[PDB]
Amino acid sequence: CFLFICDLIRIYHHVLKVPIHESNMNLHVEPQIFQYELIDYLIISYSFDLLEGILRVLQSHPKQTYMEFFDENILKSFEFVYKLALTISYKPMVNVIFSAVEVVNIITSIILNMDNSSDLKSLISGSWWRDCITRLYALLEKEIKSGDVYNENVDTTTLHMSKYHDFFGLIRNIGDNELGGLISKLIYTDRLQSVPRVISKEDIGMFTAPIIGYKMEKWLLKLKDEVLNIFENLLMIYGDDATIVNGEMLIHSSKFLSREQALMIERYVGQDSPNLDLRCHLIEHTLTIIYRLWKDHFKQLREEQIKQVESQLIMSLWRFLVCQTETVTANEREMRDHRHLVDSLHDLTIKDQASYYEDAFEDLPEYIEEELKMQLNKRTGRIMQVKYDEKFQEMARTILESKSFDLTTLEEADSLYISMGL
Amino acid sequence: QLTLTTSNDVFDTLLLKLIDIFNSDDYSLRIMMTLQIKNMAKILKKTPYQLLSPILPVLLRQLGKNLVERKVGFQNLIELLGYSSKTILDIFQRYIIPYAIIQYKSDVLSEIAKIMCDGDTSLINQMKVNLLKKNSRQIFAVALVKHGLFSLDILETLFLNRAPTFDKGYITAYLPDYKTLAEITKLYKNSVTKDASDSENANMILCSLRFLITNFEKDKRHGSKYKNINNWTDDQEQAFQKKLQDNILGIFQVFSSDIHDVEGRTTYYEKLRVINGISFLIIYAPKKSIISALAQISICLQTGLGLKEVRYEAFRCWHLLVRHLNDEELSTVIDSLIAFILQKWSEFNGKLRNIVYSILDTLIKEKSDLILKLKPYTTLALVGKPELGILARDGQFARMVNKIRSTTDLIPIFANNLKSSNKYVINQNLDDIEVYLRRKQTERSIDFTPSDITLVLGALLDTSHKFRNLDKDLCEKCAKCISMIGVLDVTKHEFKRTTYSENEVYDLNDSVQTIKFLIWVINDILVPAFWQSENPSKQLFVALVIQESLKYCGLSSESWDMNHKELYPNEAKLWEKFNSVSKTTIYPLLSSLYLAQSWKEYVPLKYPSNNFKEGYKIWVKRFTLDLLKTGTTENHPLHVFSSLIREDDGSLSNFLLPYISLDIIIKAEKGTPYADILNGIIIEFDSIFTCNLEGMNNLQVDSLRMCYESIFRVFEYCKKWATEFKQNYSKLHGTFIIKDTKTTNMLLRIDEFLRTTPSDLLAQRSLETDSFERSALYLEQCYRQNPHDKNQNGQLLKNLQITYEEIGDIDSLDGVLRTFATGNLVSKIEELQYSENWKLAQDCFNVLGKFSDDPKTTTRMLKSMYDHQLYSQIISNSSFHSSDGKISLSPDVKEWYSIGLEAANLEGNVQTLKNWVEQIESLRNIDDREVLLQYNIAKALIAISNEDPLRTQKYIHNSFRLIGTNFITSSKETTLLKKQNLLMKLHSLYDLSFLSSAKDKFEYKSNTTILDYRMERIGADFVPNHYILSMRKSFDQLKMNEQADADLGKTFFTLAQLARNNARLDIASESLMHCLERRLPQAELEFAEILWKQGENDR
């Protein structure tokens, strides 16, 4: 079934190969019909969703029998369809990007959790991974902005979830399912036919809510959590050095960490969006993707590659060690005044969880809400970008200050420490 | 993020303020600045190199003072830019070698040599001396301004210790070079803050100009006195003014070289300092030098306005130009930026809007001579945009506005403005025409004179035909303006038709007509192309050709036009044939020194290697270029014109192709290779005609139509030239038309040139071109020359009758169908459909067309129904309704579906129109150019029945896009009889938008009265009247207002009394019966005339 769905996608070769920009004389005088485009969008998206479903039911089988699934043809066919999905020169369909990276997650997750891991690893070349990881690097450096998710804008820099493929799909409910009525209106329902019922293409779109943009940002931030999660997995697969755990996980991950701290501090604090916490979870996750790369994989962190990101590595560690000053929180009275300013949405969330959906949150015995007025406090600290967690301060400390590599000299380091105190 | 809020000037200042704290030698500041510079570069969607490269000419310029000490700062800058240390150094060698050389003796030149060549095992001396010779012009420039080194031995010795291997002092006599003068004047910093330090370098570069040009061979050495300013006596000022303007068009040539930078050699800092040089020459030069090369700086400032970061300095340079110059010699350049102001107003910030306000108030107070009465379009265009707000600023200018609109007829200055080239003025003319005609409809007195509106209609048709493959939007609004004009009466309105005229006949052998050809080609097409050029390299090449054409005419090298000579009557009477709007622009470059040969990278390709697979404008330029550089040989005056056709749009190549091919014809007795390349273009014409034409979509065949037309032109020019040559050869040289048997050998080569690739194939490739008269001409030629006693008249006539049945002529179609074509009886039946018994042929076709054996005998019936307006009988045909629906994708059913959609539009019924588009939209890839128009009109009508105004405006604009790009063709070639089938569709597209644009009956009644006004320019012919009334009919019964129904009864009554006055009371009766459900009090009288025309008198 996996091989059939992969060459089914290579039959529908052209759906994931529409060009970025059209002719200036591409006249839009045309019947402007959506029904065939809706059909082959459904074919591609349900096919990639089925590939994810095949591999997660294969993930649930006993762990001695994975070699009954995998051979050369599995990995060649997924290599083709993965280069097809995470595109470079064509318009991205985001629906297949989610599933195409979740497949790579299932692959790395079972290479970690099988006993005879060599046969998968000897079956995989180096070119497979070094074509996978560069597309993951190109995916991790794309922008997630609510005001132009659903816009059609500049290519390959904004994960954007096109208007013309906005339905759920077979596993996860990814948009607001605006094209779900058209699946039902694709047939005449009182008739036996072969051609589709005519769906006008420019009738959709009619302005009420940008909350839809917030939850699509929520999915795209979970997508980037997914990408750097499979980075975290294949650090652990290739604990020894290879072609692929090769120091560019300092470059791309430290670019990512530095920019998502920078525009968090410049743009997102006090913007009453639900997606702030997860966006400051990503940085809090990717520091660890730095950290175990620093502590446990220094043998391949080449000296020329570290100085490509010596700006951004040191600055990103500095924005964690700046929190050890902590003249902001220090009490309880003004921290809840701060979380009225930055984190009122999570007060609504925890009150809806407390009054409806949590068994522990009724008859609160004055030890279970004194944990709440510890963890809402550390949450709003971690959102307010001053006072992160102490453990991430230690992980950022033991990279810069530690002498595995001289990032700073001793007279350049205290020039950074004077810009806190010290 | 203080920098992100700023723009072009303050942005570049603040980026330098970012970098001089980037190098603060505080480590924390340095790493924080790296981080912020890189994130700022990525959130602008740039790299840090293309962020900081506009200030890299300033930033590392002062690092030439300290390149040995601040090696670490330069290393930080090169690691931030992401290039190597050499890669930013050979591209910015222009800016620091003029400062690293001239400073103190312990040079940093050793390190710039150590990087600019890798390793001292590569020799630094030759690379050092050729970098010193690479940018020596800028070194001379900085030496003359920044230090004041007006002694040539100082320059010589200060070179030769920095490089002892330098050639014979300096590279000799290169100080009065054009490039050195340009690099002198590029260093004129100017601001609104006129400072003493800003006057110091102004005086310094002025005195360096005085050193370089007026006495150089007199004063190579003794130039220390020129550093003083006020010692400049009046004995030498006019000699300076004389030597300046023999030395000003080439420095503008260098300016034109480094603004329009073709290979990406530099950023816009060069463009800023070129605009500074232009500004210096506008202030500090004599007036006759600035009247001279105005059309250089016009399309220099146009490229300045076009590029975004140099807009403000170019507006300020225009503001400097608009007041250092008179009224009348400003008309040549005012349209191109009044258009830029009005068409690019929206993205102007506060500062650009303030400097454009300072343009406009200066232009309307002190130079109202240009704006009011020299060309009144420039004031009405500024009034026409209310977002700008002209009239509230002065108030007394409104007193001139509210009388300059009336007294100036505005049509012919829309006419000669739509023939322009740049897209900004021919969007402003379209936005002014669509407001002008909208005012004249409600004014009800737009002129239709039996100042003609047909002039601007021909201009609009040529404008839409010019842009068929570029910018669909101006063809959209252009076709919308044509629809706002409407259908003209074909009787009392006609295009220009300059065919019986001087008629382009010029012998390229005698002198007296070659000079007339050159003065004509300068006057009509080279002088306009001189001004309206896009890149300045094309304007320089036009200047070169228009100079060398004056040099062939004996006007350039000697100077006589100062009127102090006066002993040149032969040159004065020659000069007077130029008109003044060409005289003023051709006068400076008599004595100019343009020289742009640029040879020996040409590689003449042999001919049947075709250029079709790229395009038409590729093909005709390459073919013209392969011709004229292989058949002219540098003395015949068409040789210079080759400099124009490596940047042509294909128009000038198509212009010169008949003349150069005809001059290749007269090379006789093959002998030379001049007739060997003739055999190349014979088989190239064979490659044109004998082509495939299928397997390619509707744009390669369009290029093939153009390739047809471009070489039909050379056939008619060879024929015209040969006949006029015989005529004037028998006129002047004797009377008996035979002589010497050698000019007869000229006249035989055109005869085998007009009998090669012969007829039955000119006609075959021209009737598909749609030149039906030309196809009829070649069919008659291959009737007479073909022995027509033999039986070739079967394959000759199945397309010969096609060439009459849409040429408009019936009386030869009826004459050819009844003469030598009388085999089949069906041919005798097809005579009835044009001779008043057409319905006797209709019901014969209805049962011939219900045999289901041929696909084309059905479409014969459908076209014969459509030509006789049987729309309800088309939509009820069983050729479409098998049971309810129609067949799949369309081989020839597209010709059926076009007629079906069009007849379904012309009868207004939402049910038969709403399920037709259910069948159109079930298709996959509709290729047909003709179906999609009537489809878009159909969905406009379906949305207009759903009370949806913006959606039907959307689909009518789709219809205008499709007509303006695909359906429309060239004016001044076709008739108005063949445009009329398209003008009726445009006139019916306008009234749907004009009846949809209403909210209640108060303006709906006014719209219907305006449309009844539009039914008076229409003429009186039945087909457009019935079409436009059928479309108002189809509007008024899809919008079920009661006022629309009261309109609908009026439409049916006008259809009825239209059709009974035109001998077609078959549909007058079935239209008047719609006036009986409404029960009008007037149909009892109208049925009397229908009874009278039918033939029953007594009833």
3-state helix, strand, coil in chain B (%, to 5): 60, 0, 40
Distances in Å between the alpha carbon of B872 and those of B868, B876, B1030, B1060? 11, 6, 12, 19
Find tokens 């040529």 and name the residue.
B462
- Contact flag B472-A157 (C-beta cutoff 8 Å): no
Tokens of B1024: 């457009």
Q: How distant is the Cα of B277 from the closest Cα of chain A, in angstroms?
A: 37
Q: How distant is the Cα of A263 from the closest Cα of chain B, in angstroms?
A: 9
**Could you give the CA distance from residue B842 to residue B1095 in angstroms, rounded to a whole number?**
22
Mutate one of A29, A199, A412 to test the B interface: name it (highest B CB count within 10 A). A29
* From B31, B917, B965, residue closest to A27, measured CB to CB: B965
Q: What are the φ and ψ backbone dihedral angles of B625, each rounded to 5 degrees?
A: -75, -35
Closest among B140, B138, B100 to B116, alpha carbons compared: B100
Closest among B580, B536, B575, B544 to B558, alpha carbons compared: B575
* From B38, B79, B932, residue closest to A29, measured CB to CB: B932
A354 touches chain B (CB under 8 A): no
Mutate one of B31, B958, B959 to test the A interface: name it (highest A CB count within 10 A). B31
Distances in Å between the alpha carbon of B406 and those of A333, B372, B377, B1010? 76, 12, 12, 22
Q: How many C-beta atoms lie closer than 10 Å to residue A11's C-beta? A: 9
**Could you give the CA distance from residue B792 to residue B786 in angstroms, rounded to a whole number?**
8
Count the helices and strands in chain B (H runs, E runs): 59, 0
Q: How many C-beta atoms lie closer than 10 Å to residue B359's C-beta? A: 19
Closest among B618, B496, B495, B459 to B968, alpha carbons compared: B459
**Could you give the CA distance from residue B236 to residue B225 in angstroms, rounded to a whole number?**
14
State the virtual CA torsion across B842, B848, B849, B854 in degrees, nearest 10. Answer: -140
**Could you give the CA distance from residue B696 to residue B564 in angstroms, rounded to a whole number?**
65
Instruction: Give the SS3 label for residue A381.
Output: helix
**Could you give the CA distance from residue B228 to residue B231 in angstroms, rounded to a whole number?**
6
Find tokens 């004063």 and name the residue.
B219
Could you tell me which residues are beta bridge partners of residue A143?
A158
Q: Which amino acid is it at A157?
A: T
Closest among B263, B270, B103 to B182, alpha carbons compared: B270
Q: What are the φ and ψ backbone dihedral angles of B17, each rounded to 5 degrees?
A: -70, -30
Are residues B721 and B775 in contact, defined by beta-carbon separation less than 8 angstroms? no
Are residues B903 and B871 in contact, defined by beta-carbon separation less than 8 angstroms? yes
Partners of B35 on chain A (C-beta within 8 Å) are: 258, 262, 311-312, 315
Distances in Å between the alpha carbon of B369 and those of B291, B327, B378? 18, 6, 11
Partners of A418 on chain B (C-beta within 8 Å) are: 28
A114 touches chain B (CB under 8 A): no
Partners of A262 on chain B (C-beta within 8 Å) are: 35-36, 39
Are residues B781 and B703 in contact, defined by beta-carbon separation less than 8 angstroms? no
A157 touches chain B (CB under 8 A): yes
Tokens of B12: 């570049």
Rg for chain A, CA atoms, rounded: 24
Could you tell me which residues are beta bridge partners of residue A200?
A33
**Could you give the CA distance from residue A313 to residue A287 in angstroms, rounded to a whole number?**
10
Measured between CA atoms, the residue of chain B closest to residue A141 is B42
**Could you give the CA distance from residue B912 to residue B901 in angstroms, rounded to a whole number?**
10
Look at the alpha carbons of B736, B738, B742, B748 in this order and tell me if their dihedral is positive or negative: positive
Where does B732-797 have alpha helices with state H? Answer: 743-753, 762-766, 772-784
Burial-class residue B579 by CB neighbours within 10 Å (0-12, 13-18, 19+). Answer: exposed
Q: What are the φ and ψ backbone dihedral angles of A19, each rounded to 5 degrees?
A: -75, 160
Measured between CA atoms, the residue of chain A closest to residue B966 is A27
Q: How distant is the Cα of A338 from the closest Cα of chain B, in angstroms?
A: 25
**Could you give the CA distance from residue B561 to residue B572 in angstroms, rounded to a whole number?**
8
**Could you give the CA distance from residue A291 to residue A316 in angstroms, rounded to a whole number?**
12
Look at the alpha carbons of B776, B779, B784, B790 in this order and tell me if their dihedral is positive or negative: negative
Are residues B1034 and B941 in contact, defined by beta-carbon separation less than 8 angstroms? yes
Tokens of B205: 């570069």
- Contact flag B45-A266 (C-beta cutoff 8 Å): no
Find tokens 């030498």 and name the residue.
B236
User: What are the DSSP calls for B655-700, one per residue?
Assistant: HHHHHHHHHHHT--SS-STTTHHHHHHHHHHHHHHS---SSS-TTH
Tokens of B119: 């390793």
**Could you give the CA distance from residue B876 to residue A346 in angstroms, rounded to a whole number?**
66
Distances in Å between the alpha carbon of A353 and those of A350, A358, B533? 5, 6, 70
Partners of B471 on chain A (C-beta within 8 Å) are: 24
Write the DSSP symbol of residue A196. Answer: P
**Could you give the CA distance from residue A238 to residue A244 in angstroms, rounded to a whole number?**
8
Q: How many C-beta atoms lie closer than 10 Å to residue A341's C-beta? A: 13
Q: Which amino acid is it at B415?
A: A
* From B27, B39, B921, residue closest to A415, measured CB to CB: B27
Residues 6+ apart with CB under 8 A from B667: B631, B674, B675, B678
Q: What are the φ and ψ backbone dihedral angles of A50, each rounded to 5 degrees?
A: -70, -35
The full length of chain A comes to 422
A200 touches chain B (CB under 8 A): yes
3-state helix, strand, coil in chain A (%, to 5): 60, 0, 40
Rg for chain B, CA atoms, rounded: 36
Write the DSSP symbol of residue A325. Answer: S
Could you tell me which residues are beta bridge partners of residue A90?
A19
The full length of chain B comes to 1099
Partners of B39 on chain A (C-beta within 8 Å) are: 258-259, 262-263
Distances in Å between the alpha carbon of B538 and those of B433, B517, B647? 30, 22, 7
Partners of A310 on chain B (C-beta within 8 Å) are: 31
**Could you give the CA distance from residue A331 to residue A334 in angstroms, rounded to a whole number?**
7
User: What are the DSSP calls for A265-313, one per residue?
Assistant: IIIITT---TTHHHHHHHHHHHHHHHHHHHHH-GGG--HHHHGGGSHHH
Are residues A192 and A108 in contact, defined by beta-carbon separation less than 8 angstroms? no
Measured between CA atoms, the residue of chain B closest to residue A34 is B921
Residues 6+ apart with CB under 8 A from B296: B249, B252, B253, B255, B256, B536, B539
Where does B119-177 have alpha helices with state H? Answer: 124-132, 136-142, 152-160
Q: Which amino acid is it at B245?
A: Q
Q: What distance separates the 2 farthest-apart alpha carbons in chain A?
A: 82
Q: Which amino acid is it at B681?
A: I
**Could you give the CA distance from residue B118 to residue B113 in angstroms, rounded to a whole number?**
8
Q: How distant is the Cα of B830 from the closest Cα of chain A, in angstroms?
A: 36
Q: How many C-beta atoms lie closer than 10 Å to residue A72's C-beta? A: 9
Tokens of B121: 């095992």
Are residues B997 and B521 in contact, defined by beta-carbon separation less than 8 angstroms? no
Helix (H) or strand (E) holding B1001: helix B1001-1014
Provide the number of CB pairs (under 8 Å) joining chain A to chain B: 76
Closest among A77, A71, A74, A65 to A110, alpha carbons compared: A65
A187 touches chain B (CB under 8 A): no
- Contact flag A415-B28 (C-beta cutoff 8 Å): yes
**Could you give the CA distance from residue A75 to residue A379 in angstroms, rounded to a whole number?**
42
Could you tell me which residues are beta bridge partners of residue A158?
A143
Distances in Å between the alpha carbon of B921 and those of A413, B239, B925? 69, 78, 10
State the virtual CA torsion across B396, B402, B405, B408 in degrees, nearest 10. Answer: -80
Q: How many C-beta atoms lie closer than 10 Å to residue B549's C-beta? A: 23
- Contact flag B926-A30 (C-beta cutoff 8 Å): yes
Are residues B540 and B559 in contact, defined by beta-carbon separation less than 8 angstroms? no
A153 touches chain B (CB under 8 A): no
Tokens of B114: 């150590």
A14 touches chain B (CB under 8 A): no
Closest among B23, B36, B33 to B73, alpha carbons compared: B23
Q: How distant is the Cα of B37 from the closest Cα of chain A, in angstroms?
A: 10
Angle CA A397–A402–A403, to nearest 5 = 160
Are residues B281 and B290 in contact, defined by beta-carbon separation less than 8 angstroms? yes
User: What are the DSSP calls for B388-443, one per residue?
Assistant: T--HHHHSSHHHHHHHHTTSS--SHHHHTTTT--STTHHHHHHHHHHHHHHHHHHH
Q: How distant is the Cα of A160 from the closest Cα of chain B, in angstroms?
A: 17
Write the DSSP symbol of residue B965. Answer: I
* From A24, A154, A196, residue closest to B471, measured CB to CB: A24
A29 touches chain B (CB under 8 A): yes
Are residues B1015 and B486 in contact, defined by beta-carbon separation less than 8 angstroms? no
